[PDB]
Amino acid sequence: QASTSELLRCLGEFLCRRCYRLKHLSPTDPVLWLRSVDRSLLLQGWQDQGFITPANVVFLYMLCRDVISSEVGSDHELQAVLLTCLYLSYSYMGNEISYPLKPFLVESCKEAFWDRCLSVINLMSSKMLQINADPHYFTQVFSDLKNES
Amino acid sequence: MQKYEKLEKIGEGTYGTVFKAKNRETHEIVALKRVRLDDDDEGVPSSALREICLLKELKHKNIVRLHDVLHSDKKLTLVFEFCDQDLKKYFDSCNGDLDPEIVKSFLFQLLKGLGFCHSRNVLHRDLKPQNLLINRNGELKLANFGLARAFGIPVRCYSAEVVTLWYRPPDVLFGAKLYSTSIDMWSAGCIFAELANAGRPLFPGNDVDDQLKRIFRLLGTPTEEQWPSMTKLPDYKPYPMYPATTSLVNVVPKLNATGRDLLQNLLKCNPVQRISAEEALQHPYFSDFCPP
Numbered sequence A: 001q002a003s004t005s006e007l008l009r010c011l012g013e014f015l016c017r018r019c020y021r022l023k024h025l026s027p028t029d030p031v032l033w034l035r036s037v038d039r040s041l042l043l044q045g046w047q048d049q050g051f052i053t054p055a056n057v058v059f060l061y062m063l064c065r066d067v068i069s070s071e072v073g074s075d076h077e078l079q080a081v082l083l084t085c086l087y088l089s090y091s092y093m094g095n096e097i098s099y100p101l102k103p104f105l106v107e108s109c110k111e112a113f114w115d116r117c118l119s120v121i122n123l124m125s126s127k128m129l130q131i132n133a134d135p136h137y138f139t140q141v142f143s144d145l146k147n148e149s
Numbered sequence B: 001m002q003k004y005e006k007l008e009k010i011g012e013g014t015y016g017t018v019f020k021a022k023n024r025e026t027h028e029i030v031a032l033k034r035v036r037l038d039d040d041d042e043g044v045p046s047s048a049l050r051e052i053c054l055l056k057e058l059k060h061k062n063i064v065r066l067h068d069v070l071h072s073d074k075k076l077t078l079v080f081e082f083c084d085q086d087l088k089k090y091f092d093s094c095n096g097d098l099d100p101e102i103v104k105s106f107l108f109q110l111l112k113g114l115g116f117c118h119s120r121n122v123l124h125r126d127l128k129p130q131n132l133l134i135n136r137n138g139e140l141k142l143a144n145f146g147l148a149r150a151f152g153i154p155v156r157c158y159s160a161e162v163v164t165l166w167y168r169p170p171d172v173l174f175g176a177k178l179y180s181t182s183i184d185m186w187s188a189g190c191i192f193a194e195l196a197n198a199g200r201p202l203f204p205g206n207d208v209d210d211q212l213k214r215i216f217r218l219l220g221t222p223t224e225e226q227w228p229s230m231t232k233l234p235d236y237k238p239y240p241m242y243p244a245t246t247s248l249v250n251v252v253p254k255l256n257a258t259g260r261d262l263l264q265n266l267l268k269c270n271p272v273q274r275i276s277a278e279e280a281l282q283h284p285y286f287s288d289f290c291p292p
């Protein structure tokens, strides 16, 4: 359970449990949305290597567990929120200096995406640093993600 | 914004435009960094969001202060404290001739800001004079965190394409994929040398090979005993052995023996051997000084 595929499944299973209103969501749906972005960035030459690693999935989960409401009303909304969290993980943890917006944007309203970005940073900036600076916090988050299966 | 009156354009940053502005309600002078969100230059918001995330957590007198972030139109405006000049311009204003006490003050303040970043698990990775802001007070502030990152989480590698060439350490020039706080310590040594001379870069190489040669020609070529993992680095190649007997006296004429010793401690080729910011501040070069 330290494989990337296993942890992504754990995240997908967590999202299905969190978002109880989404009756037709598959735990593979988030996995598919994340892999697609990472693959598209590789193929289009934005990165040399894939971003989705075990530690980056732990990071993304840490954002999702605090950001994503149980009251999300659609699968589309979940995707928009999750992809916001993913784009902030790319910007914070990624090895390239810039990532483009296009693969992450699924909404027609661009300004709602940037507003959600700032709202997430306001909530999470401290924890984003802490999970780097505090190895026991990282281990605790990684353990929680595992226990989501 | 609408809360702020634009007074003039300071310049372009790594990802946006920088203005001097006035807060229309408190009358305070600030600096605005404006970032366009409807790009044809596609990745720019990414570095800005990173800067916002880090600077929210880095509140120190020797790190440029982010006050607010506004989202108003198709733009993100970051509101910072205003500083009068950068060190690069300061060098032009004083004909590259700093008094020794200002040399000490600037290094001290740089090391305090850098020590604070390192202790909070942040690497700056773009330490150079233009990223150092100076006040008429004589206060120095580390700015421009767009290339910076948090560190500590398990990672395969970091980018070796960091730091402007002239300020990049030998290990990163040899393609090291993992580095620590040592990366910024080398760059601070490079700045120290500019301060303590005539404000010109110590190692102005034209490419990676030239850069490594410049460094080794002055400092001497490290041996396997001084640096056992040097030959195992991804872009290692054999260099000539230049002697470690070359004097630093004429390279940094504003520095005494104590000053030259601190410089050599920052400019160790083996990153493990480089002095930390915390230890540099305890160096006898700063023992009789002002702030504490």
Ligand SMILES: CC[C@H](CO)Nc1nc(NCc2ccccc2)c2ncn(C(C)C)c2n1
Pocket: B010, B011, B012, B013, B018, B031, B032, B033, B064, B080, B081, B082, B083, B084, B085, B086, B089, B130, B131, B132, B133, B143, B144
């Ligand atoms: C854009 C060029 C200049 C590079 O140092 N950037 C700069 N320069 C600043 N001030 C120095 C300066 C003022 C006027 C002209 C030239 C340089 C400054 N003050 C706050 N900030 C940021 C952190 C928003 C500042 N940024």
